[PDB]
Amino acid sequence: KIIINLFAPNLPGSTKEDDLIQKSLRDQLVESIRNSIAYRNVFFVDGTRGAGKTTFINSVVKSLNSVNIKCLPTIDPTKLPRHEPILVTVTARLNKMVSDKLKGYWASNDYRKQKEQWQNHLAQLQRGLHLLTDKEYKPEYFSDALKLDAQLDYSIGGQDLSEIFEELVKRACEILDCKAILITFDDIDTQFDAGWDVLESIRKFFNSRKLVVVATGDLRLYSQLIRGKQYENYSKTLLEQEKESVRLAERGYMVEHLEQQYLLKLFPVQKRIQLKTMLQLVGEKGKAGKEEIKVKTEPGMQDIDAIDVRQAIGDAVREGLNLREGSDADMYVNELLKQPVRLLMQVLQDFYTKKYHATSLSVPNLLRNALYGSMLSSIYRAGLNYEQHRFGMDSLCKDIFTYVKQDRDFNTGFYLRPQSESEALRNCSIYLASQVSENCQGSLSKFLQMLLVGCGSVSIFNQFVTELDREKFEQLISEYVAYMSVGRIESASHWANRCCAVVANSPNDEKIGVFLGMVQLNRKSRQHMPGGYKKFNIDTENGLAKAAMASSLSTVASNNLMDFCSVFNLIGAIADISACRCERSAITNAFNKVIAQTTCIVPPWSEAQDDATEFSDAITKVEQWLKNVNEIEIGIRPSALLIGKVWSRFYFNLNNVADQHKTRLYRNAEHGRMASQSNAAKIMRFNVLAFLHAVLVEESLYHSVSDREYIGEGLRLNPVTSVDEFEKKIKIIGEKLKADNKTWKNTHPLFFLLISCPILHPFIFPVGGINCSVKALNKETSFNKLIDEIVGDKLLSDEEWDYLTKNQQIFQNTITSLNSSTIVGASYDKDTPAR
């Protein structure tokens, strides 16, 4: 069993036998070493960076020092002097080993002969050591070279340092009374420029059968080291001249063959050992892991209680990111296991240390602090923000844009999935996802800002701007980021006004005024309108309808002032109003924040009744609504995925509506009852149903506070033209929640708050935008009854509801003028087909 203690030094020098992660591999290698000496004799423990190579080797050396082999102290060429040959260091280690053995003999009758045998051998090596030191050949040593040796009678003449060291180890073994000697080289990862001297020393000197070598390092680094050294054997004049494509192709092949042949002769493949990573040891998901690993999250935890390493990261990710248990949450933890153990251990050792200290909360704050420190290097290479004290809503909305730009996936890149093939863009998705779940947690105003600013900017740019190539791309990118001023916005409403200008300039077929979620009304009266069609005027609406219609108006100045009715503005006003409850005048400054106080210019890249207490009731309802918001929204746990999915449905829904209504205007669309005829009131009605519908489906499936989905089986669609798709799901959800003894506020806080919003209620039921037929009223009346139950108060009275469905009153809660408004480019000449 393996148990890792977090509140421990957790270093290679302070790990015991019960702490190792590769205990199985250590026993496998130790037995292999013993067998080799019991019947080129070099090993290589392959392992990528940060996989714990020194920790493994120290275990191997210590186990063998507990078939008799003496183990030298470990040697790493990084810490050695930059110009010391390896043969000097290795023979220095031997000198200390044998001398300590000789001293233990005390007085020796016959071992004094051995001592002078050792001294002579060391002196013999010293005389011939100048071969590795000389920079020029010196011929006066030649007479010294031709000196016959009367002892051990070298078969081959000359210095031949290889045969001298082979003798030296042979005499050393008998002094120590063993049958093998183990030389352990550590990694050259930090400074591999000096690893070449190790490789040459191994190849040319350690060839005897009494020496066994256990190298350490990763192979990919060695490939670039040797291949680089094989290019220096060519004559530079030759590489400078024959620079044509054909010769260069052949020459590169030759270096590869020489390079590969070098490693086969040095490290035999049957001896190579590969260090398994963390994912391979614990298996994948429910598959029976080869080994089990457990940790100690709390201090003083006993051995009997300990959670799985997959579960240890499992609860941290599923709580830090506020992500529900499932396959989506399992995708992150599978990625974190692939990181090197040093990086992985540092993340865990930071999260659980801080969290226990806080307990002695805001868990997502703990996760973001851990990931930012660990994955700091990937942040810098990605160009993300790195200023700690500037963290906030504005910075996060720019990091999303500057990440998806490098992801080159504008369609679905804002999900912040860890799918990019680049390592830097895979370490940044986990970091960014921890940012959203921290800043956005516990507030509705911040949540609506992310859904509008964070994801809206990405989708709008990809459709209406990029259709206009390296120089032009950042030119538009630089123009678009500054023009809409992401990262320095003032309010969501002001952003939405700038969003109107971007969509409007790009022309569409038939030049109809209907756009993506916005309807371009008319300012100048046009003659000969059939029916009651007339210019839109704001004076007709009296109360909450006047305020709500005011919140959906935007003016763009380009050679002619233009008026739109954008659904994006309503999201801005809702985001603006719910910012604070400190003052009462705040919720009336939001209605007229942008209506007549500013003007927006066309973007550069374009090709070309007391009248004083009128808002005494609308403010009163909105004031009471903020009481509910301030209490329900505390238990809100949004995720980086929940916001991504709601925008995908919301964006798709709007684009469908704007296409199935450009041809349903005709001449008698006013009082639109048939589903085949539409006016400016139906178009704006589905633009606020679509927003509400997308929240319902996606919040149910992915929001953290709900443990299991409640939608149930069956296809999930959107109400492009009808309304029964939206009311169908609420009825299903109504039964399941009722049967399980549950309430809406505790399972769908995002939908409950938005549906019971005083601003949106007039748009849900406009005067001219209600279907009327034999079967339609069955859906509408059921839908109307269902909504009144969720809120708790009926919106419309009996006489009010009767007038809407059936063929004068002061309507304080519904728009009465939109259905008769005229949209530019809509030349009413045709007529409604009959069937």
Partner 1 sequence: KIIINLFAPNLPGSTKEDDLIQKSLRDQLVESIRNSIAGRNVFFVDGTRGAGKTTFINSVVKSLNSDQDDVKVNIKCLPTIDPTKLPRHEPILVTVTARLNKMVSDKLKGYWASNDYRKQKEQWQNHLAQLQRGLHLLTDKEYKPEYFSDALKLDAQLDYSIGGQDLSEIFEELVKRACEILDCKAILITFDDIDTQFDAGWDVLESIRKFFNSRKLVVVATGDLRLYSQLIRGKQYENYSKTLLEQEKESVRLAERGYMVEHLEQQYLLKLFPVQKRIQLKTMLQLVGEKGKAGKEEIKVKTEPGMQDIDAIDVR
Partner 2 sequence: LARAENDREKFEQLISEYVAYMSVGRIESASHWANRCCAVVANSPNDEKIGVFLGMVQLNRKSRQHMPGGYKKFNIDTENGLAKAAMASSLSTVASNNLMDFCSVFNLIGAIADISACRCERSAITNAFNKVIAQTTCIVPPWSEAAVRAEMKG
- Applying CB under 6 A, the residues found at the interface with ligand ATP are 4, 10-12, 15, 19-21, 49-50, 52-55, 186-187, 189, 341-342, 345
89 interacts with RNA by CB under 7 A: no
Query: Rounded to an integer, what distance in angstroms lies between the CA atom of residue 504 and that of residue 699?
Result: 31
* Beta strand pairing call for 272-274 and 42-46: parallel
What Å distances lie between residue 312 and 298, 473, 815, CA to CA?
A: 11, 44, 55
Written as six digits, the tokens of 636 are 């809100």
Cα(62)–Cα(66) distance, integer angstroms: 6
What element of type H or E holds 45? strand 42-46
Nearer to its own copies, 556 or 720 (CB): 556
3-state secondary structure of 308: strand
- Candidates 71-79, 462-470, 479-487, 648-656: pick the segment binding partner 2 (CB under 8 A): 648-656
Residue closer to its own copies (CB basis): 239 or 601: 601
Give the single-character DSSP code of 612. Answer: S
Restricted to residues 649-678, the positions that interact with partner 2 (CB under 8 A) are 649, 652
Write out the binding residues for RNA, residues 712-731 only, by CB under 7 A: 714-715, 717-722, 724-725
Q: For residue 319, state whether it binds RNA (rule: CB under 7 A).
A: no
State the Cα–Cα distance between residues 7 and 5, nearest whole angstrom. Answer: 6
CB of 73 to partner 1, least distance (A): 5
- 40/21 Cα distance (integer angstroms): 29
Q: What minimum distance in Å lies between the beta carbon of 651 and partner 2?
A: 11
Does position 592 bind its own copies by CB under 8 A?
no
Q: Which stretch binds partner 2 (CB under 8 A): 27-35, 659-667, 674-682, 709-717?
A: 709-717
Selected binder of partner 2 within 201, 551, 648, 678 (CB under 8 A): 648
Rounded to 10 deg, the angle between the 393-407 and 423-439 helix axes is 150
Q: Single out the segment in contact with partner 2 by CB under 8 A; choices: 130-138, 152-160, 715-723, 784-792.
A: 715-723
- Report what 221 binds from RNA, its own copies, partner 1, none; CB cut-off 5-8 Å by kind: partner 1
Closest by Cα among 820, 515, 783, 522 to 657: 515
Q: Where in 499-528 is the site for RNA (CB under 7 A)?
A: none
Q: Which of 411, 599, 616, 809 binds partner 2 (CB under 8 A)?
A: 411
Our finding on whether 715 is near partner 2 (CB under 8 A) is: yes
Q: What are phi and psi of 217, to 5 degrees?
A: 155, 180
Residues in the chain: 835
Q: Are 49 and 277 in contact (CB under 8 A)?
A: no
Is 239 an interacting residue with respect to partner 1 (CB under 8 A)?
A: yes
Q: 21 is in the binding site of which of RNA, ligand ATP, partner 1, none (Cβ under 5 to 8 A by kind)?
A: ligand ATP
Position 785 contacts partner 1 (CB under 8 A):
no
Binding mask 246-265 toward partner 1 (x if CB under 8 A, else -) reads ------x-------------
Nearer to RNA, 78 or 722 (CB): 722
Site string for partner 1, 57-96 (x = CB under 8 A): ----------------x-----x-x-xxx--xx-xxxxxx
The pair of structure tokens assigned to 619 is 């403010």
- Range in contact with partner 1 (rule: CB under 8 A) among 335-343, 733-741, 809-817, 825-833: 335-343
Q: Which CB atom, from 347 or from 720, has the smaller least distance to RNA?
A: 720
Whole-angstrom Cα distance, residue 678 to residue 671?
Answer: 9
Least separation in angstroms between residue 219's CB and partner 1 is 12
Query: Of 352-360, 595-603, 647-655, 680-688, which segment contacts its own copies by CB under 8 A?
Result: 595-603
**Identity of the residue, 49 or 535, whose beta carbon is nearer to ligand ATP in the bound complex:** 49
Cβ atoms < 10 Å from Cβ of 220: 11
Q: Considering only residues 133 through 192, tell me which ones interact with RNA, judged by CB under 7 A.
A: none
Cβ-based nearer residue to its own copies, 597 or 807: 597
Outline where 284-340 has alpha helix (H): 309-320, 327-338
- Residue 203 binds to partner 1 (criterion: CB under 8 A): yes
Does 561 engage in binding with its own copies (CB under 8 A)? no
Q: In terms of DSSP bridges, do strands 600-601 and 272-274 run parallel, antiparallel, or are they unpaired?
A: unpaired
Interacting residues with partner 1 between 368 and 427 (CB under 8 A) = 370, 373-374, 376-378, 380-381, 386, 388-389, 423-424
In 413-444, which positions are buried (b, 16+ CB within 10 angstroms) versus exposed (e)? bbbbbbebeeebbbbbbbbbbbbbbbbbbbbb
Give one DSSP letter per residue of 210-276, joined into a string: SEEEEEEE-HHHHHHHHHHHHGGGS-HHHHHH--SHHHHHHHHHHHHHHHHHHHHHHS-GGGEEE--
Residue 563, strand partner residues = 555
CB-nearer residue toward partner 1: 203 or 728: 203
Min separation Cβ 670 and RNA, Å: 19
Interatomic CA distance for residues 333 and 385, integer angstroms: 25
Q: How far is the CB of 344 from partner 1 (least distance, A)?
A: 11
Q: Which does 490 bind (CB under 5 to 8 A by kind): partner 1, its own copies, partner 2, none?
A: its own copies
Among RNA, partner 2, partner 1, none, residue 433 binds (CB under 5-8 Å by kind): none
Token pair, residue 21, equals 């992660």
Q: Site for RNA (CB under 7 A): how many residues?
A: 16
Is the Cβ of residue 649 or residue 682 nearer to partner 2 in the bound state?
A: 649
Closer residue to ligand ATP, CB minimum distance, 347 or 366: 347
Task: Count CB atoms within 10 A of the CB of residue 264.
Answer: 9
Continuous segment of H or E residues that includes residue 355: helix 341-359
Residue 766 structure tokens: 């406009």
Binding test (CB under 8 A) with partner 1, winner from 126, 151, 616, 743: 126
At 620, the amino acid letter reads: T
Q: Which of residues 661-680 bind partner 1 (CB under 8 A)?
A: none
Q: Token digits for 807?
A: 């063929």
| Sign of the dihedral through C-alpha 534, 537, 539, 544 | positive
CA atoms of 395 and 408, how far apart (whole Å): 21
Per CB under 8 A, does 210 bind partner 1? no
Tokens 């550069």 map to which residue?
A: 604
Please report the DSSP string for 726-781 in residue order: HHHHHHHHHHHHHHTT--GGGT-HHHHHHHT-TTTHHHHS-TT----STTHHHHHH
- Binding RNA by CB under 7 A: which of 675, 701, 737, 790? 675
Pick one of partner 2, ligand ATP, RNA, none as the site partner of residue 721 (Cβ within 5 to 8 A by kind). Answer: RNA
Q: Which residue has the tokens 């494509």?
A: 245
Residues 753-782 that bind RNA (CB under 7 A): 771, 773, 775-776
d(CA 768, CA 781): 16
Q: Which residues of the shown chain bind RNA in the complex (CB under 7 A)?
A: 656, 675, 714-715, 717-722, 724-725, 771, 773, 775-776
* Site residues, its own copies (CB under 8 A): 394, 408-409, 411-412, 419-421, 462-463, 482, 485, 487-488, 490, 598, 600-601
Report the interface residues with partner 2, using CB under 8 A.
411-412, 421, 648-649, 652, 715-717
